[PDB]
């Protein structure tokens, strides 16, 4: 399996709704939880492992044997809080890059579970932070899109180094450029 890194176009592509809840989906969710634990995550979205579908696995505790394994199919953020807060975010698609993103402190979510039943849920603090980050992946949004101009400048070069790695690996021009 593999983590997709910026600027790979997968991370910007349209993510398709899921209509079929079968042994296949069950198996994908599990591979995903496993990459998330492998990488010490609290959340993980399908595009980041190379699949453009609206699926996120999430465990608020972010550790084996703690919290609860939540599957979020076709999720939507129904409400954001007015209260906002800063936090140094990372992202597996940008190895070793950390910078301040301001986000709402809490959210209310609607999604479907592994059998397709509709549920909602509310998150705050660190789970809400990560949820928002992962949910952005599902909307083709990456964390630097949410940074101020000042903060983006601090990570420009690091993003350009990733643009270059893409161009060297693929022989294609980087499809997006932070210069832009
Ligand atoms: Zn692999
Ligand atoms: Zn497993
Ligand atoms: Zn951990
Ligand atoms: Zn992710
Ligand atoms: Zn990310
Ligand atoms: Zn430049």
Swiss-Prot record:
Alphabetized, the UniProt keywords read: Chloroplast, Hydrolase, Iron, Metal-binding, Mitochondrion, Plastid, Protein biosynthesis, Transit peptide
Phenotype of the disrupted gene, per the record = Albino.
**Localization of this protein:** Plastid, Chloroplast stroma; Mitochondrion
Which tissues and organs express this gene's product? Expressed in leaves and flowers.
Which chemical reaction does it catalyze? N-terminal N-formyl-L-methionyl-[peptide] + H2O = N-terminal L-methionyl-[peptide] + formate
Identify a single GO molecular function assigned to this protein: peptide deformylase activity
Output the Gene Ontology cellular-component terms: chloroplast; chloroplast stroma; mitochondrion; plastid
How its function is modulated: the record gives:
Inhibited by actinonin.
The active site is formed by 134
What's the EC number here?
A: 3.5.1.88
What superkingdom heads the lineage?
Answer: Eukaryota
Predominantly, its location class is plastid
Q: What does this protein do?
A: Removes the formyl group from the N-terminal Met of newly synthesized proteins. Has a preferred substrate specificity towards the photosystem II (PS II) D1 polypeptide.
Name of the molecule in the record: Peptide deformylase 1B, chloroplastic/mitochondrial
Annotated source species: Arabidopsis thaliana
Q: List the taxonomic lineage.
A: Eukaryota, Viridiplantae, Streptophyta, Embryophyta, Tracheophyta
Task: Report which gene this protein is encoded by.
Answer: PDF1B
